[PDB]
Automatic annotation (TrEMBL), chains A, B:
Residues 11-43 form the PutA RHH domain. Oxidizes proline to glutamate for use as a carbon and nitrogen source. Signal peptide: none annotated. In the N-terminal section; belongs to the proline dehydrogenase family. It comes from the Bacteria. This is Bifunctional protein PutA. It comes from Pseudomonas putida (Arthrobacter siderocapsulatus).
Length: 45, 45
DNA sequence: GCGGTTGCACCTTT
DNA sequence: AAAGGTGCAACCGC
């Protein structure tokens, strides 16, 4: 993966939700950010 | 929706797929960036 | 101008 | 305190 830092726009409550999801999947929030978008494409294919 | 510019890491091909997905949903790539992540949480709830 | 990209300032966690 | 994770503003590309 060559995940570069991009200017993605996220909401405040959505931020916490993403961090909470990270705990559920047993992954670090920083890692989960990349996984969330990547898995999004994985779910629909 | 108060989507603020945050530091999200995205891969090159992932970015292109995001744009391609935007075309499928009939939305502008700029809008789809924040919609994809938001919809991700919407799909799993 | 709009869309997207980069590095760094600041807040969170060990 | 430090390292990791995060927020914001600026610049280049289309």
């Amino acid at each position: 993966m060559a995940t570069t830092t991009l200017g993605v726009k996220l909401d405040d409550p959505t931020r916490e939700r993403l961090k909470a999801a990270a705990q559920s999947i047993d992954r670090t929030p920083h890692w989960l950010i990349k996984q969330a978008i990547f898995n999004y494409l994985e779910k629909l294919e």
